[PDB]
Design an enzyme around this catalytic site. Structure first.
Site, PDB file in Angstrom:
ATOM      1  N   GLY A 121      27.430  38.412 -84.855  1.00 31.24           N
ATOM      2  CA  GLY A 121      27.937  38.608 -83.509  1.00 31.24           C
ATOM      3  C   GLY A 121      27.718  39.986 -82.910  1.00 31.24           C
ATOM      4  N   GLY A 130      25.271  42.556 -84.790  1.00 34.62           N
ATOM      5  CA  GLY A 130      25.910  43.076 -85.982  1.00 34.62           C
ATOM      6  C   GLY A 130      26.364  41.970 -86.912  1.00 34.62           C
ATOM      7  N   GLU A 164      41.952  41.675 -89.126  1.00 32.90           N
ATOM      8  CA  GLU A 164      42.628  40.797 -90.066  1.00 32.90           C
ATOM      9  C   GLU A 164      41.764  39.557 -90.260  1.00 32.90           C
ATOM     10  OE1 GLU A 164      45.890  38.807 -87.021  1.00 32.90           O
ATOM     11  OE2 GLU A 164      45.666  38.098 -89.086  1.00 32.90           O
ATOM     12  N   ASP A 198      35.656  34.818 -72.609  1.00 31.25           N
ATOM     13  CA  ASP A 198      34.761  34.151 -73.552  1.00 31.25           C
ATOM     14  C   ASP A 198      35.516  33.164 -74.436  1.00 31.25           C
ATOM     15  OD1 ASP A 198      32.332  33.522 -74.660  1.00 31.25           O
ATOM     16  OD2 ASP A 198      32.255  35.247 -76.012  1.00 31.25           O
ATOM     17  N   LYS A 201      36.181  30.012 -76.157  1.00 30.92           N
ATOM     18  CA  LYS A 201      35.517  28.809 -76.643  1.00 30.92           C
ATOM     19  C   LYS A 201      35.992  28.566 -78.076  1.00 30.92           C
ATOM     20  CE  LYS A 201      31.398  31.312 -78.181  1.00 30.92           C
ATOM     21  NZ  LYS A 201      29.968  31.617 -77.917  1.00 30.92           N
ATOM     22  N   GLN A 210      34.729  28.356 -80.884  1.00 32.04           N
ATOM     23  CA  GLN A 210      34.139  29.223 -81.897  1.00 32.04           C
ATOM     24  C   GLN A 210      34.846  30.578 -81.974  1.00 32.04           C
ATOM     25  OE1 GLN A 210      29.932  29.700 -81.352  1.00 32.04           O
ATOM     26  NE2 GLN A 210      29.629  30.842 -83.263  1.00 32.04           N
ATOM     27  N   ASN A 211      35.490  30.976 -80.880  1.00 32.61           N
ATOM     28  CA  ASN A 211      36.149  32.277 -80.814  1.00 32.61           C
ATOM     29  C   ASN A 211      37.659  32.189 -81.014  1.00 32.61           C
ATOM     30  OD1 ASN A 211      33.620  33.261 -80.331  1.00 32.61           O
ATOM     31  ND2 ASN A 211      34.014  33.951 -78.229  1.00 32.61           N
ATOM     32  N   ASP A 252      37.185  37.643 -80.926  1.00 36.13           N
ATOM     33  CA  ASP A 252      35.927  37.978 -80.258  1.00 36.13           C
ATOM     34  C   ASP A 252      36.152  38.451 -78.822  1.00 36.13           C
ATOM     35  OD1 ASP A 252      33.263  38.240 -79.492  1.00 36.13           O
ATOM     36  OD2 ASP A 252      32.637  36.405 -80.516  1.00 36.13           O
TER      37      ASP A 252
END
EC number: 2.7.11.22
Lengths: 7, 298, 257
Positions: free
Chosen positions: B13, B16, B81, B127, B129, B131-132, B145
């Site tokens: 992400g 990196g 964390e 952002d 979603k 996935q985050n 994220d």
């Protein structure tokens, strides 16, 4: 703008 | 540095690598986010400037905690964390069984609590979603994220190069609005709410125009009455086909009246009358909310 | 609705934490307030040169004042500190900042790119990555919503008076951003439309008109003597039609307080 601050 | 032992690569992400790591002195398990300073040779990336400075001020049970920032000469580490997995991975795992409604209600409840804290503290996420969003085995879900986060003490301008992925993009963004508002985050949660229920993405578009048309086919093509100003928005075209709004009992059948009401307010066209995260928490849909415990790593 | 109140409450709470030491300049061996004035005025033109937001300018000054509160700096490095603060502020507020080379170029190549980038590192460490600081600009924004009959001339004049206070540290480092914004709003509303600091804001901010009186007296003086000031970049800035030429407005003789 473009200058060196002369103090 | 020397105090951390890398366990395994966990993700990729914002230019990196992300590693699961363990503190060798305390035994603490963390998420290591590395930023290589020398590939654009422009100092610290602006996305890192915003992420660190904003997330520092966001201490909340439903926001992934920034534990430490280590700034050396040639590298820049962010210590978070650690949580086991994302909601997207969880959705996939439950594709056959489905996520039970009480757990769905709990997640949406917690997500709104974290988001309300975010907005009350002058930060837009931008952002949101699956996935985050990170979850653990105890029933918690947290926002993560913040690479696209922005402070809106002053208005945040829209950038075509910095936007959430299409499926969770608000109608105003697609229609080319000039500034962001808090409503863009609520819209994302709406799409995520519906996806949790139907086991399918609500608006899975192939392109910007296809994304819009998929939204129009479900919620109806907006006019000046429904949303004052659409016809004047930049990317609006009079040649937009005129679709009718579909009844939500056909869109999200497993929902009752309370759930249907909230989702409808979360997907309101006009951003000004779209429900706020605070007001959503007060909705009758959450009056019987509990904290169920998921089953993970299927 | 309420998240606007929570924001104003949070900004009020955070503006106390990001405030610099008011008398730090007296403990600065090599730099004076005049040199600071020359620095920020230079920054006004670089933001004008690169068409950067007014918030970016305000943030940089905040960074500078805090950095100079903790670190003693010589004359020759003062411009380097201001440049890094401007670059960092650009990274925070702008959609994308100017390149570092632009900042090296704008200093007439006084410093190198590596000097700029490591000054950025130093400023970040000294400020401990606390860059989301509340500004007079931010509070003015919050106040403007309580001007339902919105007046662009009032808003422009308030921004002008707000920016002028950034120049002189001698009286304005002892006022909070919210207080400076309060005086600037009233003074602009009074000049343009002849009315006063409204009840809705008295209820909102808790600030009475008399609570703003000391800052209001100072700011009205800055307004009056703005033509004679040694720094004129902001005045030139607000003569343009974009700001309705509010800088050219004749300030009232008295305020009757």
């Amino acid at each position: 703008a473009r200058k060196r601050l002369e103090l | 540095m020397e105090n951390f032992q890398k366990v395994e690569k966990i993700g990729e992400g914002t230019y990196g690598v992300v590693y699961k790591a363990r503190n060798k002195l305390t035994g603490e398990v963390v998420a290591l986010k590395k930023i290589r300073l020398d590939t654009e040779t422009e100092g610290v990336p602006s996305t890192a400037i915003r992420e660190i400075s904003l997330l520092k001020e966001l201490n909340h049970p439903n926001i992934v905690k920034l534990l430490d920032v280590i700034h050396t000469e040639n590298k820049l580490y962010l210590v978070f964390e650690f949580l086991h997995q994302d909601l997207k991975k969880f959705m996939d795992a439950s594709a056959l069984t489905g996520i039970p409604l009480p757990l769905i209600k709990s997640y949406l409840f917690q997500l709104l609590q974290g988001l309300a804290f975010c907005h009350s503290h002058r930060v837009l996420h931008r952002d949101l979603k699956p996935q985050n969003l990170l979850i653990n085995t105890e029933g918690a879900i947290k926002l993560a994220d913040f690479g696209l986060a922005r402070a809106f003490g002053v208005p945040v301008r829209t950038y075509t190069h910095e936007v959430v992925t299409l499926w969770y993009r608000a109608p105003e963004i697609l229609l080319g609005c000039k500034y962001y508002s808090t409503a863009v985050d609520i819209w994302s949660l709406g799409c995520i709410f519906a996806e949790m229920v139907t086991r399918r993405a609500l608006f899975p578009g192939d392109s910007e125009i296809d994304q819009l048309f998929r939204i129009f086919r479900t919620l109806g093509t907006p006019d000046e009455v429904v949303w004052p100003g659409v016809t004047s928005m930049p990317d609006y075209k009079p040649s937009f086909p005129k679709w009718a709004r579909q009844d939500f009992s056909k869109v999200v059948p497993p929902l009752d009246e309370d759930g249907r009401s909230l989702l409808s307010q979360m997907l309101h066209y006009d951003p000004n009358k779209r429900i706020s995260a605070k007001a959503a928490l007060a909705h009758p849909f959450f009056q019987d909310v509990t904290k169920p415990v998921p089953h993970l790593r299927l | 609705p309420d998240y606007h109140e929570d924001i104003h409450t949070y900004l009020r709470e955070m503006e106390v934490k990001c405030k610099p030491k008011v008398g730090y300049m007296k403990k600065q061996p090599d730099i004076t307030n005049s040199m600071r004035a020359i620095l920020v005025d230079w920054l006004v033109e670089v933001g004008e040169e690169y068409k950067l937001q007014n918030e970016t300018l305000h943030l940089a000054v905040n960074y500078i004042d805090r950095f100079l509160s903790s670190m003693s700096v010589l004359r020759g490095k003062l411009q380097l500190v201001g440049t890094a603060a401007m670059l960092l502020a650009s990274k925070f507020e702008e959609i994308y900042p100017p390149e570092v080379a632009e900042f090296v170029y704008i200093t007439d190549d006084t410093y190198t790119k590596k000097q700029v980038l490591r000054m950025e590192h130093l400023v970040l460490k000294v400020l401990t990555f606390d860059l989301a600081a509340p500004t007079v600009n931010q509070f003015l924004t919050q106040y403007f919503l309580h001007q339902q009959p919105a007046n662009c001339k009032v808003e422009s004049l308030a921004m002008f008076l707000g920016e002028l206070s950034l120049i002189d540290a001698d009286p304005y480092l002892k006022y909070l951003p919210s207080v400076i914004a309060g005086a600037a709003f009233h003074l602009a509303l009074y000049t343009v439309t002849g009315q006063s600091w409204p009840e809705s804001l008295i209820r909102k901010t808790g600030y009475t008109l008399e609570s703003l009186k000391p800052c209001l007296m100072d700011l009205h003086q800055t307004y009056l003597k703005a033509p004679q000031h040694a720094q004129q970049s902001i005045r030139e800035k607000y003569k343009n039609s974009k700001y309705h030429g509010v800088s050219l407005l004749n300030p009232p003789e008295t305020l009757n307080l």
